[PDB]
Symmetry: C3
Amino acid sequence: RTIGIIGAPFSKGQPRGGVEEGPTVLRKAGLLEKLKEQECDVKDYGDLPFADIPNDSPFQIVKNPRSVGKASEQLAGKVAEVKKNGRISLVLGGDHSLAIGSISGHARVHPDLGVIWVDAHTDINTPLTTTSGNLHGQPVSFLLKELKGKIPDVPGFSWVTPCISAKDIVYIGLRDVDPGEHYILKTLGIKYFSMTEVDRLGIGKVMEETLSYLLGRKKRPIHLSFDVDGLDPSFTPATGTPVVGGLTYREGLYITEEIYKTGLLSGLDIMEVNPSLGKTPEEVTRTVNTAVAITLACFGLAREGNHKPIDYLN
Amino acid sequence: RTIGIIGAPFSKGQPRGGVEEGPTVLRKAGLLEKLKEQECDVKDYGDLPFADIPNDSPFQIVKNPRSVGKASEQLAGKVAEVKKNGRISLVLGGDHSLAIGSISGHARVHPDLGVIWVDAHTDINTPLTTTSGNLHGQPVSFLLKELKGKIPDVPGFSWVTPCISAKDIVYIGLRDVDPGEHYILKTLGIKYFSMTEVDRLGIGKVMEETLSYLLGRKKRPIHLSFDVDGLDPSFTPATGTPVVGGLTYREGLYITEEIYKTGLLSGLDIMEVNPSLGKTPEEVTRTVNTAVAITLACFGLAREGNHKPIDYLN
Amino acid sequence: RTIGIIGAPFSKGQPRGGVEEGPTVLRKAGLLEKLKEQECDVKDYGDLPFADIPNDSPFQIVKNPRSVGKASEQLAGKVAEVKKNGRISLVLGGDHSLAIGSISGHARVHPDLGVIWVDAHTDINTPLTTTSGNLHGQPVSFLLKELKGKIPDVPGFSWVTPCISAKDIVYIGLRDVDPGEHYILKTLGIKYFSMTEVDRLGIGKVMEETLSYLLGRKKRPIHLSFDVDGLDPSFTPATGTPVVGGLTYREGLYITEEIYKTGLLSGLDIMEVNPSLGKTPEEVTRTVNTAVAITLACFGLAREGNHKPIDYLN
Ligand SMILES: N=C(N)NC[C@H](N)C(=O)O
Ligand SMILES: N=C(N)NC[C@H](N)C(=O)O
Ligand SMILES: N=C(N)NC[C@H](N)C(=O)O
Ligand SMILES: [Co+2]
Ligand SMILES: [Co+2]
Ligand SMILES: [Co+2]
Ligand SMILES: [Co+2]
Ligand SMILES: [Co+2]
Ligand SMILES: [Co+2]
């Protein structure tokens, strides 16, 4: 596939610092090269230069609203640019708050997009329902059209325009959802597969249902927002808010291998990789390595193998 | 749900000491509080004061028959009391021999009860078939009506009255069964899902079948006897007789989440947690933490989330 | 079952030394005894004395062709001998290149054999498609009749005669396949279940399909070539070429428990156990222990339990 890489070293969506190093470590793991090593046409748009906003006091409980809203605004423009270039945007990021800009920018060029959100969390708290005030746990609330009237005017998000309906998104991996978030899930009728459903159906049926649900009516561009804490912390420990009982490495690759095969992936986010939270240098590489494997699968790397259009035996 | 907590610091059902500390560590992990943190009405009946029986020589091969039979006799009375109070009995115990008193006491108030036994073992050896002489591996034999004639009069169990039929129990997680125990399984036609069946069907079908098998004919109270060594030792290492290839954390929560949803749980045992067998302080917390998570799920904690009967967006 | 044990301390099929110690460590783990401990008739044919071939320069890129071809030639004769004795051959080996002799010798006595290859790799590279030159990654190419014309005359393999068709083999566990190997898979129409398929279908359906595919038409002897790197390295780390995202311990036992139940197993290989590659003494025992468990299951050891044809309650 044709890829448009976007580095988003941002962390203000949550407390822990180290997430802005995600692009750095992921690139240094040889992600660009390894992608090119496949049948991929890769163009790096570099790391977005997120200007420092020293003056950014809390909006009620919401922390760093201006810094977050600005970073997402910038990322949205860069993402829309890449799509206009006919490339799949690959956002190497910091915290998941960036999803607001990523999905917004993508929807400008492809308003008919469907979203698959792999995460241990729903990140659908509103500025009013959140108890942490961390914006990486509210991105989805800003994008949903149905919640357009329940979201206050938070400094930094004047540019935001809800671009998706509760029916154009599917969650996979949920295992830590706030009461307010669960209320929204049930109220808006959002389709989700928490770890309970994965256990019940198996990752195979979960993906069949997911794609069927999003592509049943008609084929449409797919945006995959992958939070690394969606996978079990035995695989991606270096992350801000880990939760045990997560998706396995295998299930992670299965999800992505399936998305790739649809031939409809046009947007991807690899989020929450925080190198500073690895208790050992090995937990860091284990997290980065896993994050790269997930990425490579999104672009064709298959476990059963891959081969060029030629006669290898001749 | 309405809960009746019963502490059973007993260990004489097996060799290793540390199991009598199960109640202590589980309560200190904040189990009562966390249960109350949910929509639970909790009443603690304290830790049963199991008097010391200095004179208790072996009955043939069976060890500490009087101490075990007495502890179970006491627990049975305390359990029957809690049920008469309209509460779900939660037995925080030491070794699994206590299951004899727990299930006996429960059946006095609800003779139509069905049992789900999550364990790496069948614990169905008779005083005559056992090779270890440890009573935590014989509880089921004392409760089965069909085996009423194959169980000798063991000092301390004169009060025992077989209260369940081979058809009112389902095993889940089996992976270490003695030849004599397997003979009983096949002879009495007991329904079981060893790790082989879990692998073949998936934990989802296993629970569908289990509940269908026990609640198909009619709805009836459910007694869940959960031995922590039923889960893989990578999750609950601090336990007396661990066996690799066990149920996963996820499968563990799935089982319990499903039991809860039946709305028929009225008896629960969380057994074999031995803090003294953790090779590290972390193996201890990992075991206790997992044991608490299992418990919380039995009373409503859902991975997809929970919310109060109110409008969170207002 | 009646077993014929064959030790094959060979390593020249790949770079790392320690694999020739496989027989040693496996026997010292009490494999013979434990097999006898079951309803097994065991006869040890000892460890094959593989003479040293000092003069063995590479054939193009292929390393140690004479040493490998000779060891396999010897093993083939020893294996054919054991089958003529009406025993199931159990090859405790070094590297997987020995599969060439094992399967060849087995097919001489049972030309209608079907093969199940559990491995992270397809080991189907030809001397011409291989990029490593390591023969433990080419065994299958030497045995397939369809590739008879694409295999050059490599010093040491004049005795070889392709003995199986692409349709008499099923792969399980694939997750690291070379482009040339994948081309062969798709071209010859070989049946396989990579980790992608295991994830999609579940190990239960995978085995149903495997056996159905190999025994559907008619019942025929089964040859199981089990490479320990087929299982996840968290279970068998002491091995030459480990790959993450492998089969679980449970899935490993499930596969073998199912093979056993067919009552058609007549050939078995337990390969790639390299004690020298364990980073700790525990990784070594974990690998050997797992390798023994796999073996025991092939000969009857069931997780649900086993019992003699007698009345245990009497
Ligand atoms: N994305 C996370 N980690 N969410 C946690 C919690 N639901 C919040 O909004 O802070
Ligand atoms: N419950 C256990 N660990 N049972 C082991 C063995 N079946 C016994 O009776 O001692
Ligand atoms: N069997 C292994 N490890 N194969 C690796 C690779 N396909 C080769 O031929 O060297
Ligand atoms: Co998350
Ligand atoms: Co997230
Ligand atoms: Co047990
Ligand atoms: Co038990
Ligand atoms: Co291999
Ligand atoms: Co191999």
